[PDB]
């Protein structure tokens, strides 16, 4: 795996994970992000 | 007229025909620790806005 192309994929997967975690925290217990 | 204590005491007007006198005794808490005090004196005490 070449680093330059993999870094963008890792960044975008991180963005997706952050969005999913934010939406999860807006639930009842959570943290309300 | 002093630091740490004061007395003020503008005198009461003399009554005409006996009668009682309602008195309003309040105590107000302001700030913490040693404060300098009133800016001028008894002219710095406003009862309603005067």
């Amino acid at each position: 795996q070449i680093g330059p192309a993999a870094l963008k994929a890792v960044y975008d997967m991180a963005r997706k994970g952050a969005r999913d975690e934010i939406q999860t925290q807006m639930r009842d217990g959570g943290l309300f992000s | 007229m002093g630091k740490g204590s004061s007395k003020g005491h503008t005198p009461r007007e003399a009554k005409d025909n006996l009668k009682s006198t309602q008195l309003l005794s309040v105590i107000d808490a302001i700030s913490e620790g040693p404060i300098e005090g009133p800016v001028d004196g008894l002219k710095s005490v406003l009862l309603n806005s005067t």
Binding site: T24, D28, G29 | -
Partner: protein
């Protein structure tokens, strides 16, 4: 601790143990459907796995995210199933995407499975050795030409609920027609637009005061017919 039988506890501590099979049941009877039974594997005779006398059919199914945590968000597991041959699609268009159904998961050691599963039989067969969990389907998260993913939730899941719930209104009844609080049991009178009808299948209260008067049920009216003028 969970109330599980001593045989399962004895098996759990063994160095070399049997395979732990997970049997799934989808119950859509409360939402107008049927009950389906699935297992990720067949048995040694190429047949659906028989547990407690019930056949669990072979179908690719796998659950994940099962945990018991009280602090924080209520746990939401997921269940991935095969959508080849469009079977789940068929359920999605008939059961409003299976939403509201029940999912029952049983963990069973293969040593306690029914003797019919194995060619040489099962001497230690015991139909009372299982660990049962119940969840509800919240959303069919993905449905494609290959697979289908369902979000699961605890049956309690106090997500959208409020307390207290009954709302004080004028010009509108908050009761359920012919319910316990409404307390109406008379014949068909009118429809939801107050038009009189003798059809029992078209009898619905308009929830207004006129709809209540049509049934002479103003005493049980769920609204408060004075608050509209005191709120000014």
């Amino acid at each position: 601790m969970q109330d599980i039988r001593q045989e399962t506890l004895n098996e759990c501590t063994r160095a070399e143990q049997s395979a732990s099979v997970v049997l799934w049941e989808i119950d859509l009877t409360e939402v107008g459907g049927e009950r389906y039974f699935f297992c990720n594997e067949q048995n040694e005779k190429g047949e659906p796995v028989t547990w407690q006398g019930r056949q669990y059919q072979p179908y690719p199914i796998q659950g994940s995210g099962f945990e018991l945590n009280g602090k924080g968000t209520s746990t939401r597991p997921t269940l991935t199933v095969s959508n080849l041959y469009g079977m789940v699609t068929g359920m999605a268009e008939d059961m409003q995407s299976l939403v509201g159904g029940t999912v029952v998961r049983r963990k069973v050691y293969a040593r306690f499975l029914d003797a019919v599963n194995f060619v040489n039989g099962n001497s230690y067969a015991d139909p009372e050795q299982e660990v049962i969990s119940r969840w509800r389907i919240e959303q069919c998260s993905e449905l494609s030409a290959v697979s289908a993913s369902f979000v699961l939730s605890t049956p309690t899941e106090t997500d959208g609920a409020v307390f207290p719930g009954r709302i004080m209104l004028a010009n509108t009844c908050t009761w359920t027609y012919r319910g316990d609080e409404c307390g109406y049991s008379g014949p068909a009178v009118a429809d939801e637009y107050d038009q009189p009808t003798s059809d029992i299948t078209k009898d619905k209260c308009s929830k207004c005061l006129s709809g209540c008067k049509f049934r002479n049920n103003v005493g049980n009216f769920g609204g408060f017919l004075s608050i509209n003028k005191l709120s000014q």
